[PDB]
Amino acid sequence: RFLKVKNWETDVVLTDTLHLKSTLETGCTEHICMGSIMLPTKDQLFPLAKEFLDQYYSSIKRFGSKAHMDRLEEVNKEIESTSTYQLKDTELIYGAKHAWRNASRCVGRIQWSKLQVFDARDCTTAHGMFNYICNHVKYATNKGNLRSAITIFPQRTDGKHDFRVWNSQLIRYAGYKQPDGSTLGDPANVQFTEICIQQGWKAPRGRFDVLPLLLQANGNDPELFQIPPELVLEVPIRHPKFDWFKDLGLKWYGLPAVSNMLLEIGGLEFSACPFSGWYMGTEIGVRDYCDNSRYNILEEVAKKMDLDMRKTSSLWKDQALVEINIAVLYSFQSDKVTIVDHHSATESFIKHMENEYRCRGGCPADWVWIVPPMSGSITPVFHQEMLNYRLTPSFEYQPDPWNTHVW
Amino acid sequence: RFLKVKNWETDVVLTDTLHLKSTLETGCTEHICMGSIMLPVRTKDQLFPLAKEFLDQYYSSIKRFGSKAHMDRLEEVNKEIESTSTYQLKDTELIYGAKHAWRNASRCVGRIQWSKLQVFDARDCTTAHGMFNYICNHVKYATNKGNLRSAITIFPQRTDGKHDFRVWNSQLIRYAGYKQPDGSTLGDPANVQFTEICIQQGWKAPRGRFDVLPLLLQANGNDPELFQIPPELVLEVPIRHPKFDWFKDLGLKWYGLPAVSNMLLEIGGLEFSACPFSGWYMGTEIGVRDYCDNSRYNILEEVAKKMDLDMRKTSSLWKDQALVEINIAVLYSFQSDKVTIVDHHSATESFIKHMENEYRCRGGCPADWVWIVPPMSGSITPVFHQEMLNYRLTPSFEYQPDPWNTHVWKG
Ligand code: HEM
Ligand code: HEM
Ligand SMILES: C[C@H](O)[C@H](O)[C@H]1CNc2nc(N)[nH]c(=O)c2N1
Ligand SMILES: C[C@H](O)[C@H](O)[C@H]1CNc2nc(N)[nH]c(=O)c2N1
Ligand SMILES: CON(C)C(=N)/N=C/CC[C@H](N)C(=O)O
Ligand SMILES: CON(C)C(=N)/N=C/CC[C@H](N)C(=O)O
Ligand SMILES: [Zn+2]
Numbered sequence: 001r002f003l004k005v006k007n008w009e010t011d012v013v014l015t016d017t018l019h020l021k022s023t024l025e026t027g028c029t030e031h032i033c034m035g036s037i038m039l040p041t042k043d044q045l046f047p048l049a050k051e052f053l054d055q056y057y058s059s060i061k062r063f064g065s066k067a068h069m070d071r072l073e074e075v076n077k078e079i080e081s082t083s084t085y086q087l088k089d090t091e092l093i094y095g096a097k098h099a100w101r102n103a104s105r106c107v108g109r110i111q112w113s114k115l116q117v118f119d120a121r122d123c124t125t126a127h128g129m130f131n132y133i134c135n136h137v138k139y140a141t142n143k144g145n146l147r148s149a150i151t152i153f154p155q156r157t158d159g160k161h162d163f164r165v166w167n168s169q170l171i172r173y174a175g176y177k178q179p180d181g182s183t184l185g186d187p188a189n190v191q192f193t194e195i196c197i198q199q200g201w202k203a204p205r206g207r208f209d210v211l212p213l214l215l216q217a218n219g220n221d222p223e224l225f226q227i228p229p230e231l232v233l234e235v236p237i238r239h240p241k242f243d244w245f246k247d248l249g250l251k252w253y254g255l256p257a258v259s260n261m262l263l264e265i266g267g268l269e270f271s272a273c274p275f276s277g278w279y280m281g282t283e284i285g286v287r288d289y290c291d292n293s294r295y296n297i298l299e300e301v302a303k304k305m306d307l308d309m310r311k312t313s314s315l316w317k318d319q320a321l322v323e324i325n326i327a328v329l330y331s332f333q334s335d336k337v338t339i340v341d342h343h344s345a346t347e348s349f350i351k352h353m354e355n356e357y358r359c360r361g362g363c364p365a366d367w368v369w370i371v372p373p374m375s376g377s378i379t380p381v382f383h384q385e386m387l388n389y390r391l392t393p394s395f396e397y398q399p400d401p402w403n404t405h406v407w
Numbered sequence: 408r409f410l411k412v413k414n415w416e417t418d419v420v421l422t423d424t425l426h427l428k429s430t431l432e433t434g435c436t437e438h439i440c441m442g443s444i445m446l447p448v449r450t451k452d453q454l455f456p457l458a459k460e461f462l463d464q465y466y467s468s469i470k471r472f473g474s475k476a477h478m479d480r481l482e483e484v485n486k487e488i489e490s491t492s493t494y495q496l497k498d499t500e501l502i503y504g505a506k507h508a509w510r511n512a513s514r515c516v517g518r519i520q521w522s523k524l525q526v527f528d529a530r531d532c533t534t535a536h537g538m539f540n541y542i543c544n545h546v547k548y549a550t551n552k553g554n555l556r557s558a559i560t561i562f563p564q565r566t567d568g569k570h571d572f573r574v575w576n577s578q579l580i581r582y583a584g585y586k587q588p589d590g591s592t593l594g595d596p597a598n599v600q601f602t603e604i605c606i607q608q609g610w611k612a613p614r615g616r617f618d619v620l621p622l623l624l625q626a627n628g629n630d631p632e633l634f635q636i637p638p639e640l641v642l643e644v645p646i647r648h649p650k651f652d653w654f655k656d657l658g659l660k661w662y663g664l665p666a667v668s669n670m671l672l673e674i675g676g677l678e679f680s681a682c683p684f685s686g687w688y689m690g691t692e693i694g695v696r697d698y699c700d701n702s703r704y705n706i707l708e709e710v711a712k713k714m715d716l717d718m719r720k721t722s723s724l725w726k727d728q729a730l731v732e733i734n735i736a737v738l739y740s741f742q743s744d745k746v747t748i749v750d751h752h753s754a755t756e757s758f759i760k761h762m763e764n765e766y767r768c769r770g771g772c773p774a775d776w777v778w779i780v781p782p783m784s785g786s787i788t789p790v791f792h793q794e795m796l797n798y799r800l801t802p803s804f805e806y807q808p809d810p811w812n813t814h815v816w817k818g
Pocket of ligand 4: 382384386443444777
């Protein structure tokens with residue numbers, strides 16, 4: 001019941017005790033493992049609140065102090081009365097840093113404690129949300145020297161007054177279905193792109209159109225807004241040895257900023273909480289560019305390289321994959337936009353795991369997400385056993401608002 | 408109740424009911440997933456149920472469930488168990504059993520082939536020398552001059568746990584590992600311990616980078632014995648690259664026949680502790696893992712040096728570039744010598760088709776995603792995007808401890 005994890009390349013064995021503090025369910029049972037599935041009252045609120053405050057006061061070496069006992073009463077009285085409660089700033093900051101700390105799918109968590117938290121709980125309108133977001137984007141972009149940040153909008157009330165960013169990331173490219181049957185731009189965003197168009201956006205109908213923000217305050221209908229282009233840092237993609245690479249016409253944006261998730265802290269639900277850090281190269285080079293259902297450029301790149309595309313066993317896909325990812329790296333580096341390669345990231349995450357094992361007694365890690373989608377086994381995370389479990393505070397998925405929202 | 412898996416690339420949704428016929432445990436609980444953990448004397452008491460379940464399966468497969476021959480077989484197994492404590496499989500039940508253990512191996516990407524398996528019945532074997540003869544026949548049959556054929560050889564089942572047949576090698580064919588006084592390793596570092604055991608048992612070691620290990624064989628719970636596979640039976644392939652002429656001068660080769668020999672086969676509750684089986688290699692096994700694991704041959708530096716890559720920063724992706732070239736070389740070398748091999752694109756595509764067939768015909772297909780997805784180019788193979796349910800079905804192959812860890816030395 002104290003569990004061991006072995007690294008098979010180093011034989012380093014770590015003992016996990018943090019899992020016993022585990023809260024939610026995984027989706028697995030003793031009969032069936034669901035490891036590779038993508039999506040596997042006043043009465044409820046007080047336990048959740050207490051559980052959170054207890055770990056907060058423990059973290060600041062004040063467990064069982066009068067300041068602890070007092071906050072616990074003050075929160076309880078506020079729930080008994082208002083049916084919700086408000087977090088102190090210090091708790092909000094702790095809660096967000098820790099939700100990132102607990103994110104089992106994030107390889108970048110060595111960074112978890114440098115998070116700039118922007119408290120937007122005073123926001124009331126879409127225009128206000130727009131101001132907050134532009135500010136986050138500029139702050140985080142930092143002219144290419146990216147800094148992690150989250151912006152937190154007001155917490156859920158009766159669930160008819162939700163704040164929501166409808167975008168899946170603050171910045172993403174448009175996707176359009178054509179008469180052709182094919183898809184122009186990013187096919188991941190086809191549906192959102194049509195919701196924007198349906199709302200009244202004028203699409204340039206190109207390959208890399210930055211989507212408009214679609215913002216919903218206090219449960220109202222959402223509203224379109226263009227992010228000032230001078231705030232959207234983008235990198236043209238070239239290759240350090242293939243001169244023709246630039247003619248492929250590829251670019252990507254510098255700032256990854258997930259915006260459709262829900263932050264839960266002490267039973268409280270923050271349904272609009274966009275956060276951002278910086279890219280690992282493979283996210284763009286392998287997934288965004290090469291997934292068959294994304295930009296799908298392997299065919300075209302291989303041609304420019306004059307590889308034998310006649311049989312799979314030439315490994316032409318694999319060969320092209322590497323060059324594309326060399327190119328993503330080289331470009332961001334050339335332009336001084338922060339980016340991390342998969343070797344460095346995974347090495348860092350291993351050191352993070354070791355840190356957490358000795359300091360916290362463990363680290364929840366979803367191996368399926370942690371191992372990069374190229375060159376898996378030449379990264380140390382491949383050989384690392386990982387235990388996956390759910391801790392709060394957390395980031396959780398939540399339904400796309402268009403299936404829910406009342407118009 | 409039914410369970411769905413989705414392919415995120417095609418939106419194809421599958422429904423699994425087969426997991427309902429699982430009972431063995433996974434290592435996971437509702438609070439912890441152990442999906443990436445490598446490793447997460449039976450009495451009459453347990454035995455008849457395990458026998459019954461298996462024979463109910465066998466008899467349904469052959470469309471004879473509830474038949475007179477079905478019922479008589481249950482009754483006869485029942486009587487044999489109570490009289491003798493154990494029972495013997497018929498030849499047909501053994502064949503069906505070994506095939507189904509392959510079919511249910513959730514870590515095998517090659518299962519499209521599950522029904523084409525040559526079963527060698529070595530249940531009459533009594534000595535190590537007898538084991539050696541059986542294994543040679545296996546290797547010559549499976550090898551077939553490069554045109555590989557899947558096969559398994561099944562030595563007598565466990566009785567009291569004191570009379571076990573064991574193949575002490577982890578594969579029938581594999582290279583020696585030698586730890587030097589300077590702390591480096593010559594040959595394969597995966598095989599250092601087993602190599603040391605062989606030497607202690609009397610093996611004269613050539614001490615090279617690719618010495619084919621001797622078979623170390625145990626019959627009927629006796630001290631195991633050494634045997635040299637005849638070299639003319641060991642197909643090996645020198646590794647060269649179609650465009651890099653210096654590649655051959657690295658001096659790499661590999662054997663063509665992968666044959667796992669240290670697993671236990673369970674059929675209707677019986678335990679076959681020596682059951683070596685073989686098919687053919689997926690290229691990444693040798694190219695990615697055997698050559699490129701840091702704990703294995705570890706050739707990335709030597710290779711990349713030769714390619715004159717920028718080795719001064721990881722972000723050149725010099726490792727990734729050399730890895731691809733090494734894998735191209737492995738597949739080129741095998742195909743040029745007409746030894747069967749499969750690339751990872753081809754093997755994963757076939758597996759997805761196998762998997763869907765199995766959902767439609769069988770009601771499911773247990774798969775372990777962590778193992779199925781190849782250790783290079785993960786997401787450009789269709790399995791990466793395929794959700795999978797992992798669970799334990801019988802008949803099965805299982806791990807078992809290395810025999811030097813349990814064996815009582817006779818002398
Ligand atoms: C600072 C640099 C960071 C790096 C290099 C990094 C790395 C990654 C990578 C590679 C993924 C997989 C994403 C995908 O495959 O789509 C990921 C997922 C995740 N990251 Fe991090 N991350 C970083 C910062 C952050 C921050 C600041 C937060 C929250 C405050 C965070 C929370 C998460 C969450 C919740 C997921 C899973 C998203 C999902 O399930 O779709 N990351 N991260
Ligand atoms: C026909 C050619 C075959 C191919 C291309 C194939 C493919 C693979 C690959 C790539 C692995 C992963 C091995 C590793 O990473 O160490 C594997 C594992 C496995 N395969 Fe297959 N296989 C084939 C035939 C068979 C046969 C004939 C059996 C037994 C009847 C079998 C049963 C297994 C089992 C039990 C494992 C798990 C081994 C372990 O956990 O260490 N395979 N196979
Ligand atoms: C089916 C499978 O779980 C799915 O493809 C996962 C696998 N691993 C992943 N890993 C990361 N980092 N990102 C992803 O989107 C996925 N997709
Ligand atoms: C800890 C981790 O599960 C381990 O390294 C696994 C991952 N996936 C694998 N997949 C295959 N095919 N072979 C392996 O040896 C491994 N190793
Ligand atoms: C916000 O999370 N971070 C910092 C990150 N690197 N990646 C997030 C998801 C981005 C997505 N994989 C993409 O490729 O755009
Ligand atoms: C026995 O299973 N088969 C046929 C197979 N392809 N792989 C078996 C293990 C081989 C091991 N990974 C190796 O590289 O030697
Ligand atoms: Zn699990």
